[PDB]
Design a binder for these strands. Structure first.
Length: 410
RNA sequence: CUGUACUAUA
């Protein structure tokens, strides 16, 4: 028949008429309320589409809960499609609803029901200002649900927008860190290798690693790059881990004594396996020659404690020899390192661990190692006995004496 | 006389 070109009707009054609300706090339009901030029972999704009020419901708590509850999950439903198109016609409106205290929860809902086609236009909108969406307290939850839910090439294309950005700022941010960890915990290393190249710099690693939030970023990266373990005929992850663990090893002395970085150092020491070489470097270059000072610190004494727990015998021997005979006695008190750590409110925990390691190590298969652990336990016992009159009045001394109890130091 | 962090939105 004859062609019919149906243009859409111009309506530049919708926003001006949906800007009228009852409460100045709510944004729900007055045609849809019941007077009490709730959504009237005659209101249907066809009414929302007809009055062009998707934004105004999404910016209100009860209107957005209405949208989330009645949003059709099926991708071929007509109302689903019309609502999705209203969401994504304007990029700036979409990025406003992502950054909205309430609207984000709707955006996450359309992610949960999405198909590759929808994910493509969602990804293209998010990529234009991904970094600022990651800093936002509301939009970062959208970004993380995207990283989980998108097809892997789409999420890769998204996370690559973070390259050449101020990643120190984003990593130590209250909101941004959980994005970066999500990337590292979900996407293939090929999608975030620029993070490992960024943390290869010493300055960036220290600033990010010595932070409330960035130390969890560094630890999540180390966990993901090391958990590969075997299943690898080649490497790649080993070279990336090596590139990162290099800076940790070069700056471990500072990191081990920091209020936050101590936990990353403990993870490296405690992990073993693929991190077991790096563990050894940390003890030989940072802990050794500094056991007495680090065992007196609030943060580093946990590092010394896990180092006694997890080290191989050949390093336990050097640590024991440093405590027992590696320090000059105090000029006025003639006090050695062991005497200091017995009565010290942090170092007592180190002494309790030395005893535990020597007790567990008596059951080792090698005879000489068993005799050496027995020798070290006997040295600690003698000093505890010469100071038991004072140690029995402390909780720590009661723990120490009960640990040395009824032993066979063969 | 007992000693450290993050685990964030209605």
């Amino acid at each position: 028949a004859v062609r019919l070109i149906d243009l859409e009707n111009n309506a530049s009054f919708s926003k001006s008429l949906n800007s009228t609300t009852r409460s100045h706090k709510c944004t729900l339009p007055i045609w849809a309320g019941d007077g009490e901030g709730n959504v009237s029972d005659s209101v249907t999704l066809q009414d929302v589409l007809a009055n062009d009020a998707l934004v105004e419901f999404a910016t209100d708590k009860n209107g957005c809960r209405f949208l989330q509850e009645h949003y059709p999950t099926e991708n071929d439903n007509d109302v689903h499609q019309k609502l999705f198109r209203k969401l994504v016609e304007d990029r700036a409106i979409f990025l406003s609803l992502c950054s909205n205290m309430f609207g984000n929860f709707f955006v996450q809902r359309v992610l949960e029901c999405s198909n590759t086609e929808e994910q493509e236009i969602l990804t293209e909108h998010l990529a234009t200002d991904l970094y600022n969406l990651c800093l936002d307290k509301s939009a970062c939850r959208v970004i993380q649900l995207a990283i989980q839910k998108l097809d892997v090439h789409l999420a890769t294309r998204l996370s690559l927008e973070l390259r050449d950005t101020h990643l120190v700022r984003l990593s130590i941010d209250q909101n941004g860190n959980h994005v970066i960890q999500k990337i590292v915990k979900t996407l293939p290393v090929s999608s975030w290798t620029f993070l490992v190249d960024f943390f290869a710099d010493d300055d960036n690693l220290i600033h990010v690693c010595q932070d409330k939030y960035g130390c969890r970023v560094i630890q999540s990266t180390v966990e993901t790059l090391s958990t590969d373990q075997y299943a690898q005929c080649y490497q790649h992850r080993v070279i990336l881990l090596r590139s990162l663990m290099a800076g940790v090893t070069r700056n471990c002395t500072q990191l081990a004594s920091n209020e936050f970085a101590n936990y990353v150092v403990q993870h490296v020491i405690k992990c073993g396996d693929a991190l077991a070489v790096y563990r050894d470097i940390i003890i030989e270059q940072c802990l050794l020659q500094n056991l007495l000072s680090m065992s007196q610190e609030k943060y580093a004494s946990h590092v010394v404690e896990v180092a006694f727990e997890c080290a191989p015998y050949r390093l336990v021997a050097e640590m024991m020899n440093e405590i027992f005979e590696g320090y000059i006695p105090h000029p006025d008190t003639n006090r050695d390192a062991l005497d200091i750590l017995l009565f010290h409110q942090y170092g007592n925990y180190v002494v309790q661990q030395m005893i535990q390691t020597c007790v567990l190590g008596q059951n080792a298969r090698d005879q000489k190692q068993s005799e050496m652990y027995g020798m070290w336990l006997e040295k600690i016992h003698g000093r505890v006995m010469r100071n038991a009159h004072r140690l029995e009045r402390f909780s720590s001394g009661k723990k120490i004496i009960e640990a040395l109890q009824s032993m066979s130091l063969y």
